[PDB]
Amino acid sequence: KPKDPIYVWAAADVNLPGTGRPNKSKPIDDLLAKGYDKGQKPAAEEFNYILNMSSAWVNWIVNEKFPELEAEIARLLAELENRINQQLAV
Amino acid sequence: LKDVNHIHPLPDFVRGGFDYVPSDIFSGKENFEQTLRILLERLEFIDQKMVELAELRTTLNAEDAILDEIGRQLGIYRNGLNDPEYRAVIMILTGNNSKSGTRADIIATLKQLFGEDGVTTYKGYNYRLDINIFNTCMEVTDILPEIIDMLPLVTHLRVVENQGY
């Protein structure tokens, strides 16, 4: 419904001149459980990684899982109807 | 030890000339002094205004009523700009004539518009450049067109402005 195609944040993986490191790095699990506090300022890698997570997975849900699922349910119904059709034919 | 610019109001102009009364013959007569003082003090006003006729015509202090004349000679028309920033654009465009758009050079030109710590510049791999503003004292949208002009032919630019860090 929303009028903008889902854009995956930091889709590409590359080195940044500022850091020299990969654009995305996994936050340490301590931070994942805890989060930030006043005074902390995020590192770019963790920010990019989190946004890429939350965008790529929504993209997957919308464009891969569902288009698969409607097709699968339709095919299931069609095959059940077909089987009952051979059963009736006799 | 001495100023090179000799254009200044003459110090103690009035008491001079009175020094040329020969031998105090008339001094203390209170009739000749007033007549001489009244005439000399007129030159004081004219002498004073001789400076502003030169001082005020400089681009640094020129008022908008005549600053337009300075800009007109250079082809920089007022358009919709106001006085405080119209001065800035005049400086920016004129300074562009001896520039090469280097990283060190770009910082120098932005230095005159945002103080010492009011600006910073990030750089990117594929022609990306970024400008950061912290202490703007003038509205930037009208100044923006020039900020593009002094950059290489293929720059890719982002502009973000905020107050403080």
mmCIF file of C-alpha atoms in Angstrom:
data_model
loop_
_atom_site.group_PDB
_atom_site.id
_atom_site.type_symbol
_atom_site.label_atom_id
_atom_site.label_comp_id
_atom_site.label_asym_id
_atom_site.label_seq_id
_atom_site.Cartn_x
_atom_site.Cartn_y
_atom_site.Cartn_z
ATOM 1 C CA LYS A 1 0.000 0.000 0.000
ATOM 2 C CA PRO A 2 2.650 2.605 0.911
ATOM 3 C CA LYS A 3 3.630 4.440 -2.235
ATOM 4 C CA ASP A 4 7.411 3.878 -2.134
ATOM 5 C CA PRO A 5 9.200 0.653 -3.134
ATOM 6 C CA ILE A 6 11.097 -0.873 -0.222
ATOM 7 C CA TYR A 7 14.731 0.272 -0.386
ATOM 8 C CA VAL A 8 17.257 -1.879 1.471
ATOM 9 C CA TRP A 9 19.571 0.330 3.510
ATOM 10 C CA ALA A 10 23.284 -0.178 2.858
ATOM 11 C CA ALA A 11 22.471 -2.987 0.437
ATOM 12 C CA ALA A 12 25.981 -3.047 -1.017
ATOM 13 C CA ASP A 13 28.965 -4.079 1.102
ATOM 14 C CA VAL A 14 32.151 -2.059 0.614
ATOM 15 C CA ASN A 15 34.992 -0.348 2.457
ATOM 16 C CA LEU A 16 34.449 3.253 3.509
ATOM 17 C CA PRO A 17 37.360 5.705 3.130
ATOM 18 C CA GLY A 18 36.569 7.225 6.518
ATOM 19 C CA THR A 19 36.843 3.953 8.430
ATOM 20 C CA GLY A 20 38.524 1.659 5.929
ATOM 21 C CA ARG A 21 36.239 -1.095 7.248
ATOM 22 C CA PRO A 22 33.233 -2.918 5.790
ATOM 23 C CA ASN A 23 30.175 -0.682 5.779
ATOM 24 C CA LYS A 24 28.295 -3.106 8.063
ATOM 25 C CA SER A 25 29.450 -4.838 11.240
ATOM 26 C CA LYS A 26 27.500 -6.902 13.735
ATOM 27 C CA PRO A 27 26.965 -5.126 17.077
ATOM 28 C CA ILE A 28 28.287 -7.085 20.038
ATOM 29 C CA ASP A 29 25.475 -9.075 21.643
ATOM 30 C CA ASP A 30 25.899 -7.091 24.867
ATOM 31 C CA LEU A 31 24.733 -3.990 23.008
ATOM 32 C CA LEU A 32 21.948 -5.914 21.251
ATOM 33 C CA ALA A 33 20.509 -6.936 24.615
ATOM 34 C CA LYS A 34 21.206 -3.565 26.225
ATOM 35 C CA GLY A 35 21.067 -0.711 23.722
ATOM 36 C CA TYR A 36 22.475 2.796 23.962
ATOM 37 C CA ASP A 37 22.599 5.309 26.812
ATOM 38 C CA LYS A 38 22.922 9.083 27.064
ATOM 39 C CA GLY A 39 26.452 10.127 26.172
ATOM 40 C CA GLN A 40 26.984 7.282 23.714
ATOM 41 C CA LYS A 41 27.275 8.149 20.030
ATOM 42 C CA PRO A 42 26.746 5.254 17.603
ATOM 43 C CA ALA A 43 29.428 3.814 15.384
ATOM 44 C CA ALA A 44 28.460 3.963 11.718
ATOM 45 C CA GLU A 45 28.913 0.224 11.162
ATOM 46 C CA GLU A 46 26.340 -0.841 13.760
ATOM 47 C CA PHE A 47 23.842 1.765 12.561
ATOM 48 C CA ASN A 48 24.170 0.571 8.969
ATOM 49 C CA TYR A 49 23.952 -3.081 10.013
ATOM 50 C CA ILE A 50 20.760 -2.563 12.020
ATOM 51 C CA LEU A 51 19.048 -0.580 9.273
ATOM 52 C CA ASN A 52 20.091 -3.123 6.638
ATOM 53 C CA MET A 53 18.652 -5.878 8.829
ATOM 54 C CA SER A 54 15.298 -4.181 9.295
ATOM 55 C CA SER A 55 14.986 -3.193 5.626
ATOM 56 C CA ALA A 56 16.265 -6.337 3.898
ATOM 57 C CA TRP A 57 14.041 -8.621 5.946
ATOM 58 C CA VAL A 58 10.925 -6.565 5.180
ATOM 59 C CA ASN A 59 11.931 -6.670 1.510
ATOM 60 C CA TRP A 60 12.238 -10.451 1.722
ATOM 61 C CA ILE A 61 8.846 -10.791 3.409
ATOM 62 C CA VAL A 62 7.079 -8.590 0.876
ATOM 63 C CA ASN A 63 8.705 -9.713 -2.376
ATOM 64 C CA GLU A 64 9.703 -13.374 -1.850
ATOM 65 C CA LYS A 65 7.702 -15.119 0.877
ATOM 66 C CA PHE A 66 4.229 -13.880 -0.044
ATOM 67 C CA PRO A 67 4.426 -14.056 -3.868
ATOM 68 C CA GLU A 68 5.534 -17.630 -3.148
ATOM 69 C CA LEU A 69 2.728 -18.282 -0.658
ATOM 70 C CA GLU A 70 -0.215 -17.088 -2.761
ATOM 71 C CA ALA A 71 1.087 -19.148 -5.686
ATOM 72 C CA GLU A 72 1.495 -22.200 -3.449
ATOM 73 C CA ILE A 73 -2.005 -21.959 -1.956
ATOM 74 C CA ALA A 74 -3.531 -21.440 -5.402
ATOM 75 C CA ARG A 75 -1.653 -24.459 -6.762
ATOM 76 C CA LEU A 76 -2.743 -26.567 -3.778
ATOM 77 C CA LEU A 77 -6.400 -25.692 -4.345
ATOM 78 C CA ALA A 78 -6.054 -26.356 -8.073
ATOM 79 C CA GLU A 79 -4.466 -29.764 -7.478
ATOM 80 C CA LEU A 80 -7.125 -30.817 -4.967
ATOM 81 C CA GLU A 81 -9.822 -29.765 -7.427
ATOM 82 C CA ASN A 82 -8.038 -31.696 -10.175
ATOM 83 C CA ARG A 83 -7.845 -34.864 -8.073
ATOM 84 C CA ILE A 84 -11.536 -34.631 -7.239
ATOM 85 C CA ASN A 85 -12.135 -34.130 -10.967
ATOM 86 C CA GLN A 86 -10.468 -37.437 -11.860
ATOM 87 C CA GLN A 87 -12.440 -39.045 -9.032
ATOM 88 C CA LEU A 88 -15.712 -37.705 -10.466
ATOM 89 C CA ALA A 89 -14.814 -38.589 -14.057
ATOM 90 C CA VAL A 90 -15.378 -42.288 -13.343
ATOM 91 C CA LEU B 1 55.842 52.847 13.667
ATOM 92 C CA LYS B 2 53.688 54.873 11.269
ATOM 93 C CA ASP B 3 50.539 54.083 9.327
ATOM 94 C CA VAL B 4 51.008 53.767 5.578
ATOM 95 C CA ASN B 5 47.508 55.125 4.870
ATOM 96 C CA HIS B 6 47.887 58.904 5.052
ATOM 97 C CA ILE B 7 44.169 59.579 4.480
ATOM 98 C CA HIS B 8 43.107 60.605 7.989
ATOM 99 C CA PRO B 9 41.482 63.670 9.555
ATOM 100 C CA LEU B 10 44.152 66.258 10.208
ATOM 101 C CA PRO B 11 45.018 66.123 13.934
ATOM 102 C CA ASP B 12 44.188 69.327 15.820
ATOM 103 C CA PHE B 13 43.300 71.206 12.625
ATOM 104 C CA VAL B 14 41.741 74.159 14.466
ATOM 105 C CA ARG B 15 44.659 75.137 16.712
ATOM 106 C CA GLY B 16 46.845 75.182 13.629
ATOM 107 C CA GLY B 17 46.625 78.416 11.705
ATOM 108 C CA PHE B 18 45.978 80.159 14.997
ATOM 109 C CA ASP B 19 49.651 79.305 15.525
ATOM 110 C CA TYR B 20 50.355 81.683 12.625
ATOM 111 C CA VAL B 21 49.136 84.765 14.512
ATOM 112 C CA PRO B 22 52.472 86.634 14.505
ATOM 113 C CA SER B 23 53.262 87.700 18.079
ATOM 114 C CA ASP B 24 50.036 87.305 20.090
ATOM 115 C CA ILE B 25 49.127 90.813 18.891
ATOM 116 C CA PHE B 26 45.444 89.923 18.555
ATOM 117 C CA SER B 27 45.283 87.064 21.063
ATOM 118 C CA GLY B 28 43.132 87.906 24.059
ATOM 119 C CA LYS B 29 41.032 90.435 22.151
ATOM 120 C CA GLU B 30 37.999 88.101 21.825
ATOM 121 C CA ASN B 31 36.839 90.025 18.743
ATOM 122 C CA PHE B 32 39.266 88.854 16.049
ATOM 123 C CA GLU B 33 39.450 85.299 17.391
ATOM 124 C CA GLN B 34 35.733 84.630 16.977
ATOM 125 C CA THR B 35 35.776 85.961 13.418
ATOM 126 C CA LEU B 36 38.722 83.720 12.538
ATOM 127 C CA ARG B 37 37.369 80.713 14.439
ATOM 128 C CA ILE B 38 33.985 80.917 12.712
ATOM 129 C CA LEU B 39 35.617 80.777 9.275
ATOM 130 C CA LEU B 40 38.179 78.082 10.081
ATOM 131 C CA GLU B 41 35.686 75.764 11.777
ATOM 132 C CA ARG B 42 33.766 75.578 8.491
ATOM 133 C CA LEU B 43 36.771 73.874 6.898
ATOM 134 C CA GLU B 44 36.659 71.366 9.764
ATOM 135 C CA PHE B 45 33.388 69.935 8.471
ATOM 136 C CA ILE B 46 34.611 69.801 4.869
ATOM 137 C CA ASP B 47 37.939 68.312 5.961
ATOM 138 C CA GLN B 48 36.129 65.586 7.892
ATOM 139 C CA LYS B 49 33.832 64.624 5.004
ATOM 140 C CA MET B 50 36.822 64.309 2.658
ATOM 141 C CA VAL B 51 37.591 60.995 4.370
ATOM 142 C CA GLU B 52 34.148 59.384 4.200
ATOM 143 C CA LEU B 53 34.084 60.253 0.499
ATOM 144 C CA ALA B 54 37.005 57.798 0.259
ATOM 145 C CA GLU B 55 36.479 55.575 3.310
ATOM 146 C CA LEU B 56 32.820 54.774 2.645
ATOM 147 C CA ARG B 57 33.402 53.904 -1.025
ATOM 148 C CA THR B 58 35.385 50.782 -0.091
ATOM 149 C CA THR B 59 33.517 47.511 -0.554
ATOM 150 C CA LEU B 60 33.944 46.548 3.111
ATOM 151 C CA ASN B 61 31.898 49.490 4.428
ATOM 152 C CA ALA B 62 29.939 50.550 1.325
ATOM 153 C CA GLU B 63 26.237 50.965 2.069
ATOM 154 C CA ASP B 64 23.627 49.306 -0.138
ATOM 155 C CA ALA B 65 22.691 52.608 -1.798
ATOM 156 C CA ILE B 66 26.155 52.735 -3.409
ATOM 157 C CA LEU B 67 27.302 49.117 -3.025
ATOM 158 C CA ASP B 68 25.107 48.459 -6.058
ATOM 159 C CA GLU B 69 27.433 50.727 -8.040
ATOM 160 C CA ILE B 70 30.430 48.619 -7.009
ATOM 161 C CA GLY B 71 28.584 45.428 -7.908
ATOM 162 C CA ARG B 72 27.383 46.911 -11.186
ATOM 163 C CA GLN B 73 30.948 47.423 -12.412
ATOM 164 C CA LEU B 74 31.620 43.726 -11.728
ATOM 165 C CA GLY B 75 28.379 42.435 -13.258
ATOM 166 C CA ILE B 76 27.031 41.145 -9.919
ATOM 167 C CA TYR B 77 23.487 42.483 -9.788
ATOM 168 C CA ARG B 78 21.486 42.727 -6.574
ATOM 169 C CA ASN B 79 18.601 40.525 -7.770
ATOM 170 C CA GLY B 80 16.724 39.767 -4.516
ATOM 171 C CA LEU B 81 19.722 39.796 -2.171
ATOM 172 C CA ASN B 82 19.766 41.984 0.931
ATOM 173 C CA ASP B 83 22.644 44.145 2.116
ATOM 174 C CA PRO B 84 24.383 41.830 4.640
ATOM 175 C CA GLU B 85 24.664 38.904 2.222
ATOM 176 C CA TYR B 86 24.957 40.972 -0.963
ATOM 177 C CA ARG B 87 28.364 41.918 0.414
ATOM 178 C CA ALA B 88 29.202 38.228 0.806
ATOM 179 C CA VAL B 89 28.342 37.228 -2.764
ATOM 180 C CA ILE B 90 30.452 40.093 -4.112
ATOM 181 C CA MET B 91 33.445 38.805 -2.155
ATOM 182 C CA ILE B 92 32.833 35.169 -3.103
ATOM 183 C CA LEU B 93 32.553 35.706 -6.857
ATOM 184 C CA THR B 94 35.539 38.060 -6.977
ATOM 185 C CA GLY B 95 37.677 35.614 -5.010
ATOM 186 C CA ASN B 96 36.789 32.825 -7.435
ATOM 187 C CA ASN B 97 39.014 34.304 -10.165
ATOM 188 C CA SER B 98 42.234 32.991 -8.555
ATOM 189 C CA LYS B 99 41.085 29.558 -7.394
ATOM 190 C CA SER B 100 41.556 25.916 -8.312
ATOM 191 C CA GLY B 101 38.924 24.116 -6.209
ATOM 192 C CA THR B 102 41.350 22.098 -4.103
ATOM 193 C CA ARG B 103 40.385 20.664 -0.728
ATOM 194 C CA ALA B 104 42.630 23.131 1.091
ATOM 195 C CA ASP B 105 41.378 25.929 -1.157
ATOM 196 C CA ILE B 106 37.680 25.184 -0.617
ATOM 197 C CA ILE B 107 38.109 25.309 3.160
ATOM 198 C CA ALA B 108 39.636 28.777 2.868
ATOM 199 C CA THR B 109 36.662 30.311 1.041
ATOM 200 C CA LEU B 110 34.118 28.772 3.416
ATOM 201 C CA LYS B 111 36.245 30.091 6.280
ATOM 202 C CA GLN B 112 35.141 33.693 5.671
ATOM 203 C CA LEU B 113 31.424 32.828 5.926
ATOM 204 C CA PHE B 114 31.210 30.665 9.069
ATOM 205 C CA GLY B 115 34.021 31.675 11.420
ATOM 206 C CA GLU B 116 36.809 29.297 12.390
ATOM 207 C CA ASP B 117 34.955 26.185 13.582
ATOM 208 C CA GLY B 118 31.619 26.728 11.842
ATOM 209 C CA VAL B 119 32.327 24.523 8.809
ATOM 210 C CA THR B 120 33.706 21.065 8.046
ATOM 211 C CA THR B 121 33.952 18.975 4.874
ATOM 212 C CA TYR B 122 33.732 15.216 4.389
ATOM 213 C CA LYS B 123 35.033 13.524 1.245
ATOM 214 C CA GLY B 124 33.843 10.442 -0.613
ATOM 215 C CA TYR B 125 35.317 7.872 -2.985
ATOM 216 C CA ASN B 126 33.206 8.466 -6.118
ATOM 217 C CA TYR B 127 33.307 12.254 -6.506
ATOM 218 C CA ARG B 128 31.207 12.675 -3.355
ATOM 219 C CA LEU B 129 31.797 15.786 -1.254
ATOM 220 C CA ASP B 130 29.890 17.023 1.791
ATOM 221 C CA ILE B 131 29.597 20.438 3.449
ATOM 222 C CA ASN B 132 28.659 20.906 7.109
ATOM 223 C CA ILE B 133 27.612 24.210 8.690
ATOM 224 C CA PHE B 134 27.508 24.922 12.425
ATOM 225 C CA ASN B 135 27.388 28.703 12.961
ATOM 226 C CA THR B 136 25.652 30.263 9.962
ATOM 227 C CA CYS B 137 24.929 33.973 10.389
ATOM 228 C CA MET B 138 23.023 34.446 7.111
ATOM 229 C CA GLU B 139 20.334 32.588 5.201
ATOM 230 C CA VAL B 140 22.060 30.059 2.966
ATOM 231 C CA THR B 141 19.601 29.261 0.161
ATOM 232 C CA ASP B 142 20.338 32.539 -1.629
ATOM 233 C CA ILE B 143 24.094 32.030 -1.191
ATOM 234 C CA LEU B 144 23.891 28.430 -2.416
ATOM 235 C CA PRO B 145 24.232 29.113 -6.181
ATOM 236 C CA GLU B 146 27.750 30.484 -5.724
ATOM 237 C CA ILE B 147 28.805 27.640 -3.408
ATOM 238 C CA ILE B 148 28.434 25.360 -6.441
ATOM 239 C CA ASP B 149 30.450 27.556 -8.789
ATOM 240 C CA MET B 150 33.864 27.204 -7.103
ATOM 241 C CA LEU B 151 33.830 23.390 -7.232
ATOM 242 C CA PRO B 152 35.325 21.064 -9.870
ATOM 243 C CA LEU B 153 33.344 20.376 -13.029
ATOM 244 C CA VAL B 154 32.245 16.935 -11.801
ATOM 245 C CA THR B 155 31.615 17.410 -8.074
ATOM 246 C CA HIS B 156 28.764 15.606 -6.321
ATOM 247 C CA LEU B 157 27.665 17.746 -3.399
ATOM 248 C CA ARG B 158 25.471 17.517 -0.318
ATOM 249 C CA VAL B 159 24.603 20.484 1.897
ATOM 250 C CA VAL B 160 23.476 20.180 5.515
ATOM 251 C CA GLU B 161 23.155 23.060 7.966
ATOM 252 C CA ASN B 162 22.608 23.019 11.719
ATOM 253 C CA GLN B 163 23.282 25.212 14.749
ATOM 254 C CA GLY B 164 26.185 24.009 16.874
ATOM 255 C CA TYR B 165 27.750 20.553 16.693
#
